[PDB]
């Protein structure tokens, strides 16, 4: 107890938060800060030195900087209209690490994955395509570079943390949805996306985890992101032409209680066009708003009456 | 004049707004008189909750005919409404349930049987206590005896262990004629009691000679032994490789596990000679018993394959050869005399190791008394060798598993008095309670736990025997007092009754495996982390279990690194060899290597599957137990 509560002098008042650069096999690591102060001291307890993955933020002191510790910081067979494309992504990204009798004899291992896109986007159809991996795999989906741009300009180090947790979580499939890097400071997006491309290509890795890139348009990817970004396979999403809307709305009506009195065409094509997002919203507020009337049946005027909220929402402002 | 109308209106408004006891009184005094909407309103929900609170208040308050007439009127009324699950699950707690079910089970077979027996059997083994489950077994014996779907009545024979049920299902399964399959799970479902009682009443009549033909021996495996050679094909790269990376005089023991539990092909079995000679003494027992473990078929071939090792020049070759004779069969019992007759040596001779293999393999073959009278000078001998009383207590225990409310006779009284005779070699106080608890198995209302709490209460050796009787005395019921008592006594200073008493969790709540994972691993008592590590079990091995093996797999002590591959390979029988490559990354001592390869071969309430590992929980000892490590019978 005394030996555990005696190192409090180092972690006491003279304590700071620095950024370690690398660890040397000579048991003295190198740290840094805003001005880049490099101090090497023999390591102490409470550290792992193996899973630490040097190059992150660590704990420093006002002392000689002896390291006292560290501080860390709807299935594939439900939707219709794209069964060939969903068995294409199923058969394509469910090939590695699953069904190995036809994966190791070929000996190809293209560690790149497919790149999805869709004019509707919204993550509903793309997530419905990427849901094939949720069957038998660890849930891991890095949805876009939103956390890259909403945080301080730390660079691709967060991509290195997601890549090290994806390396410690090899039986997974890294899925990326709503890529808004260049479609939406600004000069750092090109270097963190070029380092995302370099580290994504497998600069110091092999066929461990698959990467599926999904966005709103295939033309948003720069020409640099083509040859080292797409080497496995590309897809093509056609317009829903009320058939993907018919199947998605059929799934939405497979659980709720409603007759054929509700007109389909004007509601799946109410404002301009929409597959599942706001019709899923009016199905949610249709079950809740229909539940307000203490009736499970969907009234012909309450469904369109709740639809007036979404129709008026995106048109007023 | 028409006061039932005013009582009906009074119970209508009092039942309409709120009341807890005043609702059914106008109905029990009203004498109800005088499929519709109103009938469903005042009968279905108002008489469902009405009769529910009347049966609850009159069932918990007093313990008349009014509640019987109202409860049978609800029985017929809900037989017209035809909602079995909700109405039945509400009228469970008010035999009344027997006459109710046989009063309802006329036309609906799959609804009341599948639904009522599914959710009421699951909730009956989870929450309902035993004395009502006995009514489930008797009334289910009735409605399932008069109806079809025999195998669920065979499950009623697994829970009842009655010979009239298997006799009636043999004359009823014989009157209505697969054969070999129902013999397979017939013998798998029956325990030690009703297969010898079955072989004695069927030794009496059997009416076709096919019950003594089928349900004696070799016919649970005669449908599976040839098919497994035909429908499956194993490669030689495991014999050459797994038989090639062996060295250091312990991976050769792992190669005795290769030969013993490698199975189609018999190449490594006859790969020259001197393999058994190069091995150690306990590896000569394991290697001598390997040919017995690979020959659970072809008795005539087993005799001509083990006869070469019989009466050989070495003691462990013939003793392990008698162990092989005990493993090859379980209904032949013809190899008894050549080993049973020579047992009388009593000090150090060959009959002590031939007593290990012959009493152990004979216990696997067997509840005959004569063998126990022959084992009386064995338990009274008390040799310095532990495995003598080890396989003796485990042998007579496996003979006595599933007895009628147990027994406190001079067998366990004799091994308790002779257990407390000398207070040396505590391993006796660690394996004798195993056989004791095996004799305690099969009880339904026995007071043997309190009797042991009266006589056995002593220093923590026989008190550890007492908590072992507490382990085997809690096979499972609705007794959550043992769960709060488990959490209360879980913090005991004694670091072994935590291991066994807390290790009982994988057996008590074995069926409802959703509650087995808990916060036991978050403590600092790494022994409790081993308790959860064993508490994973042998199930399908979902992602949560392997998630627990991801943290339990990485440890420095050889007891946890040695204890992880056993459950890691028993619970899982690009995802099979990958954790083994993880073991290759962790290691590259010898214990975790022999246990990680032995886990490679491991990967590739029946007492036969609950006894060998619960007795195997004492591996943290010398290599003497390693001669018994490979001959476990829990492996199908």
UniProtKB/Swiss-Prot annotation, chain A:
Listed GO MF terms: ATP binding; ATP hydrolysis activity; proteasome-activating activity; RNA binding
Residue list for modification N6-acetyllysine: 150
GO cellular component entries: cytosol; membrane; nucleoplasm; nucleus; proteasome accessory complex; proteasome complex; proteasome regulatory particle, base subcomplex
A GO biological-process term: proteasome-mediated ubiquitin-dependent protein catabolic process
Subcellular location: Cytoplasm; Nucleus; Membrane
Biased composition (Basic and acidic residues): 1-11
Binding sites annotated in the UniProt record for ATP: 118-125
Crosslink position(s): Glycyl lysine isopeptide (Lys-Gly) (interchain with G-Cter in ubiquitin): 129
Recorded disease: Birk-Aharoni syndrome: An autosomal recessive disorder characterized by failure to thrive, severe developmental delay, intellectual disability, spastic tetraplegia with central hypotonia, chorea, hearing loss, micropenis and undescended testes, as well as mild elevation of liver enzymes.
Role, per record: Component of the 26S proteasome, a multiprotein complex involved in the ATP-dependent degradation of ubiquitinated proteins. This complex plays a key role in the maintenance of protein homeostasis by removing misfolded or damaged proteins, which could impair cellular functions, and by removing proteins whose functions are no longer required. Therefore, the proteasome participates in numerous cellular processes, including cell cycle progression, apoptosis, or DNA damage repair.
Complexes and interactors: Component of the 19S proteasome regulatory particle complex. The 26S proteasome consists of a 20S core particle (CP) and two 19S regulatory subunits (RP). The regulatory particle is made of a lid composed of 9 subunits, a base containing 6 ATPases including PSMC1 and few additional components. Interacts with SCA7. Interacts with NGLY1. Interacts with PAAF1.
Name of the protein: 26S proteasome regulatory subunit 4
Gene behind this protein: PSMC1
From Swiss-Prot, chain B:
Keyword terms, alphabetized: Acetylation, Phosphoprotein, Proteasome, Repeat
GO cellular component, one term: nucleus
Modified positions (N6-acetyllysine) in chain numbering: 425
Phosphoserine: modified positions: 242, 244
Region (Disordered): 497-519
Bias (Basic and acidic residues) ranges: 497-517
Tissue-specificity statement: Found in skeletal muscle, liver, heart, brain, kidney, pancreas, lung and placenta.
PC repeats: 286-319, 320-356, 357-388, 391-425, 434-463, 592-604
GO MF annotation list: enzyme regulator activity
BP-aspect Gene Ontology terms: proteasome-mediated ubiquitin-dependent protein catabolic process; regulation of protein catabolic process
Function: Component of the 26S proteasome, a multiprotein complex involved in the ATP-dependent degradation of ubiquitinated proteins. This complex plays a key role in the maintenance of protein homeostasis by removing misfolded or damaged proteins, which could impair cellular functions, and by removing proteins whose functions are no longer required. Therefore, the proteasome participates in numerous cellular processes, including cell cycle progression, apoptosis, or DNA damage repair. Binds to the intracellular domain of tumor necrosis factor type 1 receptor. The binding domain of TRAP1 and TRAP2 resides outside the death domain of TNFR1.
Family affiliation: Belongs to the proteasome subunit S2 family.
Subunit structure: Component of the 19S proteasome regulatory particle complex. The 26S proteasome consists of a 20S core particle (CP) and two 19S regulatory subunits (RP). The regulatory particle is made of a lid composed of 9 subunits, a base containing 6 ATPases and few additional components including PSMD2. Interacts with RPGRIP1L. Interacts with CRY1 in a KDM8-dependent manner.
Protein's recorded name: 26S proteasome non-ATPase regulatory subunit 2
Organism: Homo sapiens (Human)
Full-length numbering of the shown residues: 70 to 804 of 908
